[PDB]
Design a protein around this ligand. Structure first.
Ligand SMILES: OC[C@H]1O[C@H](O[C@H]2[C@@H](O)[C@H](O)[C@@H](CO)O[C@@H]2O)[C@@H](O)[C@@H](O)[C@@H]1O
Ligand SMILES: OC[C@H]1CNC[C@@H](O[C@H]2O[C@H](CO)[C@@H](O)[C@H](O)[C@@H]2O)[C@@H]1O
Length: 349
């Protein structure tokens, strides 16, 4: 078929499976959330918590699907149908190494639901406690062993792919052990080789040697808020792509529709980026495509705490909070607008 509706398998959408519902789980997990203390504020902050009631959830927006469980197979079905609407072929799943049966169940449910719609899944390896290159290798081995034969397990030219959040927390000298072909615990040329995509944060003076010396296969930028880092400043993307191409690296810039996290981080208002009826998303996605990249990542499907979600949101005013909503756009606008941009990306590829 040549309909202009097919999934794109170089488009990665960051997905969070940490929500919990009455129907499935037993606490309204993540809809209830601690309010972060101000890192520059007084001593003796008791910032409190958002209780995750119908009226008061840990987001500035309100989901169309309500306080859903990420363990609810009927929610997962709906989510995969939303990925199909958006034309996003890869779900980049947050992964926290919880070592619990409920996590294992959820991952399996997600892979199964994804496959019914021909969506692929890769892992977004988060900064779990004492993360280091040895336990990262062990966990890569476990994920490939457990899930590598699942038909929804993502591969690019035969290789799995991982995004590594806050990769700068591990020194390049440690990364080299895992990621250089000569490294003492290398995955290169093994059954567990993978494309490893590190997080480009700050200036080229710092990031270029970091990426080279760490032996990452590529880099992404994550943040939906323009200007939050050098990497999330889209005017830098042409130059970042040129460097990537020169150095055999894969650049996967991250685009998002807006940012606001002030329910959980009330002190962080300077990072707010207004959606402007889709104009912010349009501008960011255009810059990614114009940079001439081979792959794009979307922040986010459903990071509701950070207000970067493309998942449908609805107007809601409760006794406790007046939520933001999609304004003059319909709840599914960011899904259909994603599909528009995926088409533009494909036209350029
Ligand atoms: O401090 C608020 C800030 O926190 C989180 O990002 C942190 C870290 O994970 C990032 O690597 C660096 C990049 O410079 O920034 C923080 O230290 C995110 O939640 C972010 O959106 C938020 O503004
Ligand atoms: O997936 C990368 C990155 C996205 N932003 C949130 C990060 O997770 C932290 O913040 C969450 C609230 O926004 C909180 O629920 C998590 O426990 C974690 O502190 C995530 O690493």
């Amino acid at each position: 078929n040549n309909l202009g509706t097919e999934l794109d398998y170089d488009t990665f959408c960051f997905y969070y499976d940490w929500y919990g519902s009455e129907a499935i789980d037993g606490q309204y997990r993540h809809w209830a959330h601690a309010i972060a203390p101000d890192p520059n504020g007084g001593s003796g902050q008791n910032p409190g918590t958002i209780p995750g009631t119908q009226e008061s959830i840990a987001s500035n927006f309100y989901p169309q699907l309500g306080r859903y469980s990420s363990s609810d197979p009927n929610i997962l079905t709906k989510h995969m149908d939303m990925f199909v609407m958006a034309r996003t072929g890869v779900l980049a799943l947050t992964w926290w190494n919880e070592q619990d049966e409920t996590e294992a169940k959820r991952i399996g449910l997600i892979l199964d639901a994804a496959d019914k719609k021909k969506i692929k899944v890769c892992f977004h390896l988060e900064p779990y406690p004492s993360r280091n290159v040895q336990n990262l290798r062990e966990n890569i081995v476990k994920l490939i062993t457990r899930y590598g034969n699942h038909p929804a397990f993502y591969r690019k030219d035969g290789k799995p792919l991982f995004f590594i959040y806050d990769s700068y927390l591990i020194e390049p000298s440690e990364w080299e052990k895992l990621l250089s072909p000569g490294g003492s615990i290398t995955i290169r040329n093994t059954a567990y080789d993978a494309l490893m995509i590190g997080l480009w944060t700050s200036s080229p003076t710092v990031q270029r040697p970091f990426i080279l010396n760490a032996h990452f296969d590529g880099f992404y930028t994550y943040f939906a808020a323009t200007g939050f880092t050098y990497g999330s400043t889209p005017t830098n993307w042409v130059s970042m792509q040129k460097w990537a191409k020169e150095n055999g690296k894969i650049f996967i810039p991250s685009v998002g529709p807006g940012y606001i996290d002030t329910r959980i981080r009330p002190w962080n208002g300077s990072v707010i980026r207004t959606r402007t009826d889709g104009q912010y998303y349009d501008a960011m996605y255009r810059k990614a495509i114009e940079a001439g990249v081979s792959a794009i990542s979307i922040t986010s499907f459903n990071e509701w705490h950070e207000g970067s979600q493309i998942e449908p949101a609805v107007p809601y005013t409760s006794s406790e909070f007046t939520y933001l909503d999609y304004e003059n756009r319909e709840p599914d606008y960011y899904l259909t607008r994603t599909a528009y941009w995926v088409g533009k990306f494909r036209e350029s590829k």
